[PDB]
Amino acid sequence: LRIIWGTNVSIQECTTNFRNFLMSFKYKFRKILDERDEELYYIKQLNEMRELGTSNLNLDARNLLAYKQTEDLYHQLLNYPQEVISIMDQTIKDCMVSLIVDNNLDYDLDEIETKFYKVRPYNVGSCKGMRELNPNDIDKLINLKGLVLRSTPVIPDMKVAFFKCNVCDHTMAVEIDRGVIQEPARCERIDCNEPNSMSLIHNRCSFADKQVIKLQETPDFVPDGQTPHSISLCVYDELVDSCRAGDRIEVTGTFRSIPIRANSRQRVLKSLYKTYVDVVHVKVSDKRLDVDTSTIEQELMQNKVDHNEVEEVRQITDQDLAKIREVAAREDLYSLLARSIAPSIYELEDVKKGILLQLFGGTNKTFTKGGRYRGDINILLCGDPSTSKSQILQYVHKITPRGVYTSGKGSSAVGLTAYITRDVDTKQLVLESGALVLSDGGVCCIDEFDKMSDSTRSVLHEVMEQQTISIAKAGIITTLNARSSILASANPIGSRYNPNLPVTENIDLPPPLLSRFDLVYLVLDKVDEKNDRELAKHLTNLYLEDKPEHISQDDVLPVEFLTMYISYAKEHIHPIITEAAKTELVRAYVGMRKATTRQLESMIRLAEAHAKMKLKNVVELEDVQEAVRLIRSAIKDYAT
Amino acid sequence: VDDVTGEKVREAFEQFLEDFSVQSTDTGEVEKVYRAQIEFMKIYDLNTIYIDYQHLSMRENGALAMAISEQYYRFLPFLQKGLRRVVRKYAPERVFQISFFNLPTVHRIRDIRSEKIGSLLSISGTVTRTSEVRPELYKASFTCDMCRAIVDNVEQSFKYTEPTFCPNPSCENRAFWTLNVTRSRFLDWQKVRIQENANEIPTGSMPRTLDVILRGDSVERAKPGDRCKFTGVEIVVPDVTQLGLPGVKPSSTLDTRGISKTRSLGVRDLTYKISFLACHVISIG
Amino acid sequence: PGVAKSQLLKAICKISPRGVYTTGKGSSGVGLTAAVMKDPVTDEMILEGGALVLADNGICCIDEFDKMDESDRTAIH
Amino acid sequence: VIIDLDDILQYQNEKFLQGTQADDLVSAIQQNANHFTELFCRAIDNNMPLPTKEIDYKDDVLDVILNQRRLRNERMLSDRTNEIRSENLMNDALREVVEDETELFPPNLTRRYFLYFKPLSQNCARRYRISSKPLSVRQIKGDFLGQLITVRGIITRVSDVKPAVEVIAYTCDQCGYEVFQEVNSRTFTPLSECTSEECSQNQTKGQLFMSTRASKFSAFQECKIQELSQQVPVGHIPRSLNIHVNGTLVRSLSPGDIVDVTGIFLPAPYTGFKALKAGLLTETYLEAQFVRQHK
Ligand SMILES: Nc1ncnc2c1ncn2[C@@H]1O[C@H](COP(=O)(O)OP(=O)(O)O)[C@@H](O)[C@H]1O
């Protein structure tokens, strides 16, 4: 039965064990899912692999668990990841060849088999953070989450060393393999002998690429008293740069322990090993949270194709598409989605709705050059306290892929961009991305906006207009792009803002900044009697069930459908208002003027979101009506 | 053979520039061209040249073009030696610098990898922090007192040490030094640190600079606060500062399995960082 | 001024585990928020908090709650 | 595996009466307490239920490495004795020979478990029968070094748990074998060439390099404790004291805690600026066997 010395993983016979599986699986997963696609996954998918030749079969883990056999191999993969992954790689290659010989001549012809096929297992285990982990698990597959603070530039790493001679000279080279380069003392040509120095020429040797991604993890389920830890994961090879800074990422990889020299002169090692993650697989996109835009991605589509890769942009099946294009037909859709956004949150539908358009906001324009008005639409909302105004922030924060959530007074103009901190790992000066730069794309959420210090808010006059930030300070001088929506919460002085008084006075703020916001919500309580009873019916529920179920029920609601819908809407639609709009469009603006020109900008952007929804490449003359009314909605609330 | 294959690439390139470089007929710019270039450089005798890439890529169907691009650091010596050959042939203090331009492609600094290492490439960015021009050896006359100095050679690659062989005499060695500043050849140089173009950077990754060293009459051509376009000569510089990076980091521990037991261990870590170099610099953009 | 209101708080913060007693001028704004400071031995730059973070999952206690000025009130708000 | 000095007290009042007179463990334990961990440890290693059951698959890793080490440990002996007996020319002897000519995985490298002590207060103190007098950090004179002591104070700081390495394993790859270096204090120098009995006296020594799966790591966590602030004398200021945590007790401690920590108290070499030492000093620290939290 052979063995491997420490691994209790018998070479081969796990290859058989893996093959009967690989060739025959289908779905036993649904027996765990409980059921309620027919044919097996892997031969089909491995075929797609073989024509596309993308390599990188990423498996699942667990497809294995639960299926027999391989009930064991799952354990053997979680425990002894590297070796087992090497075995599996071999197996998959051989399975390729053996699959080819069935079809005779394949892909012209025998080359593609010798090309390296490798596994990127994912979805492995439910693990608790990083911090929780014992020294008992030094090498194991492990899951992580949480946004990415910074990433170093690519560090070159040896693969095949190179050597030349003083005599004669001869060019031969020793390959690294294990982690040291052992050079022959002497010699080749002459040989001889002779004890002549063997030169190492470092430009002729072959490298691979090792990057290092710092990571701020959220395990959630926080045991306390713990504060967020930071981690460093070294990627490798193709995965390099495949992760932008600020993303929320699912990455899996092998835990690791390495010493780091203390003196940097002496041979001495510091004991007390320093630990890090090796990140075999990254899982950027998610089902539960919304999908990134295309325009922002750009190059990483235009690039990452050439060297190829996997994952990135969320992919959609056909029949579900057939479901979206069906749901679009439903007339109450614009209403429907509005109730579906915040299930817990009751009434106040136009807030839910304006935000609904904040999710679809605008259409991006480059002109010949410059231009760049983006899709950005920005929303302040104020009112009596306990109105859920913060809850929305939480929710939008949860959905929006890249967004970042900031409190008032916990903020400073230095904090929102360009820290230029000391790195302290290398004892170097490294640039960090501020909070708005991270928030670039998607939605920045802001608490207690009224309360920001006077020096702050001086950042926003830059962002709101330019849509970029201009940093001339300190080390590096550049204008860097942050294109981001803003959703700001405000508490009027009252704090009940009260009848009469100038409202425009009663939000506080400088009025110029205040006029700048796209859509400004003012929420108020008319003490409907006749309301509080209904609302209490809503909230005083749960109650039952203790395990939360049927929140808004009975109400028709989409759940994961609305995210793939929203995504789809964003990437595959680019609305234009054509001719029909302009007349009514203008007369609205004048009607308001009879305020400032921004309000117009607002309307044409906000409206195009409406039209972005409903899958219309062109705006109707209709739909600009409510698109105004939303601005007028706050006016029906400005009467008092 | 590798000597012979490389030398073949030599003869192929030399034939290239000696073979017709121009198809332009009638009104021109009628042939040649590059001979006219050698001679126009012979006018003011400043000893450096400019020759276009596109032509060279087109002529041979590119087998030669690719042979140059990919292994270019391998193929420097054959090339400038070949130029020296032609110069010796058609022309009568020897310093030569060869710089291609007009590459077919542009690569962003963030798109730089290690697979393109040692190979010519194109990189455009915003220059920052130029640095005053300092001399460099690459040809030096250094020997001990015993028995004689004036041996002049080596120190080719950045080391900067040392005399290769035929020490002392008669003290024959090993040994080391002594270096003359009275006898040696120097050239240039100025270092400049180039940054990624403001408009390009991926959100929110924020710009990251790289370092480009300017040797050649290409010196001073760069300008602070300006977009520029470079062609490759790419290479590597070693870095001490990477520790606690984390690893796993490769080392030099030597193989002593020859000889016999009756130097010590002699271990030196090798940790490199990529820094681009430049033969050619233009202000385009 | 009397009625011994704070003695109830010494009381509670004595009884409850993970209780922490603080005062306004007192506990600084940097007292409640977490600073980033280099960690000796193991590394590096760990967030060390106080008050609110230091006592959580349990009761935190405040005296002189008026004199706490402004930046503090925003945290607690 | 948690040892108690209490039940040892009862062991002695069983062996006292009801003789014969048995030498006193406990008072020898508090007064030294470092040596007894390791000795107590080998005492235990001999007598264990032997098989005791299948190792399955998981189960666990580092359990299997242990298993295979013990298994190869047995087979070596079986092979050597099998060979020797073939030559010739009561049967205890040959076993002794085999045991002393052979290199085996030392016990301390293969244990799998840890040993900790819990000191006696309590009802037992009034039995009557010291090892736990909860102490201020003022109350610690530097004359207690080595003893098993119990203190009470507030935990602060208490940095992240990380792997520290007690012994390192290398693999010659040429002579085969292994090389285990024990490691102490803060730093070490990684060995090279080869110590292999088979790579000794050879013309060419093989080169070796570490394997982090083979070596023995302990979970290390360090935490400081400050005077309870009631116990501080009228003037002055609360002092601080360092503590180390290995193995299982890790993560049991947190800031803003008021705690009775019970550990064998040992020194580790340091001083201030080199010109500031008379020598040799010790700089000390506290080691943590067992934790008892107020509240
Ligand atoms: N219409 C509503 N539907 C559901 N929950 C509500 C509604 N109005 C108020 N709430 C509840 O009241 C709380 C609102 O607090 P919040 O509005 O964040 O305070 P503030 O207005 O001071 O920011 C939330 O927990 C929210 O669930």
Ligand SMILES: Nc1ncnc2c1ncn2[C@@H]1O[C@H](COP(=O)(O)OP(=O)(O)O)[C@@H](O)[C@H]1O
């Ligand atoms: N009902 C009571 N029982 C016992 N002591 C009391 C009572 N009412 C007041 N006191 C005394 O009044 C003092 C008030 O102290 P303290 O709570 O620190 O200030 P404050 O009066 O501002 O709450 C306490 O020391 C307490 O001894």
